[model samples]
Target: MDNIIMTAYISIFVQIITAIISVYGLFIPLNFKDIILREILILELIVQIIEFIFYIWLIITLQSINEDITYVRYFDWVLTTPVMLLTTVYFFEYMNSDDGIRKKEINDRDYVYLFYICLSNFFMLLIGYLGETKQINKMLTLFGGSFFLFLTFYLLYVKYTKENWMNYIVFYFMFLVWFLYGFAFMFPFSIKNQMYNILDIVSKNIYSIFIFIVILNQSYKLLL
Candidate 1:
């Protein structure tokens, strides 16, 4: 308990350090025209990497210290949390996609994805506050589960209807919901712990590897 609090304080300090460093690299320009081409790419990659590492650190720390609070904690961390953690990903399409379908057809989708990413993080802030107050963990599960259901269905609707900016909206809706379910053990009720655990590992590895490969290939190409 004491350790958790101490670590929380330390984590805040770390956040401060990270923010400062990120701002410096991103905004400052000792050379390279202050906001040159090189600067932007470097800044984006650095920011994304920092965010990814921070979430990973937080997940590991929480797992080590706290007895899984919500049956949804696993999915929350694996699925919902990463959206916030790698918020920089919202801008990836703009950075990586060429001037074609990936860009033209998905321009609106990018903004929609960015919007939901922000919404998801905003809800998480509220959810975290609730948890801090020792609120019923089940409540979070219900809220989270309902949100996923809505998002999933909305995506399906968009896929069928091809409505306004539906492509981007549906993409995020599917990506987030499917990834989060990898940790289904953390949902409202855990039916088989061992089964969920195995599923968790399998799903997480596949998702993480695929994402990493995409990011790595794009980043390397940008560098060259």
Candidate 2:
């Protein structure tokens, strides 16, 4: 085997121990129908834990595979990314609705919005994957993925205008982290994988906490 102190293996232990401590985040209130926050936190906890498993799996299985860890690697993003996007949409929905009843309310626009964001996000992952694997040329990935990236921002911009400074702040924070994702492609997979893992927690877990406080400020009144 090619010898280097693999950060791949190092990250597995780090992530698993993380998986253990992260369980406490899930030790939240029961799924009470009245408090939407309960389910939101639960979903975030579940989403983060599942991702820890995938990244850990990707790390362990790396050396065995000859090809760039393309398909398997992308699966984690494919599974989790849309849910993170939807979490933002869900938060906005709860805010506008009568106790989250407008969760759909005759707004076909919400469905349309959901469809396009998912479509754009999928392509963003797909094209980025192709480029990272060197199946596509550099500009193809840049144009294709960046187009989707802008489309994602456009989708959020459709909603979060002067909606609130807090939301706008969180929106740009996520988008910036996403922009940072493209830069990671230049590094080797070992380094890039570490970046991905860190970005996952930053963009998703910490973002969850930010949104959680937003909910608290608006609904719970603690942050107000």
Total backbone collisions for each predicted model: 4, 0
What's the residue-level lDDT of 136 in candidate 1? 44
lDDT of 1 by residue, 70-189 (tens): 333343343444443332242333333333123234435555754564465545444543543356474674476556545534533443333346345535644555455434434332
Q: Best candidate, lDDT-wise?
A: 2
Q: What ranges in model 1 sit over 4 Å off?
A: 1-113, 120-133, 137-140, 152-205, 211-224
Worst 10 residues of 1 by lDDT: 28-37
* TM-score of each model, paired residue for residue: 0.36, 0.74
lDDT of each: 0.41, 0.65
Q: Return the top candidate by TM-score.
A: 2
lDDT of 2 by residue, 1-224 (tens): 22212544454555455455445434433223335554555566667677777766765666586666644657778888887777666665555454443233424557787878889899999998898778998789888888898898788668734477756676687789988887776677566666765666567667566545544445443323
Structure candidate 2, residue pairs in collision: none
How many clashes in candidate 2? 0
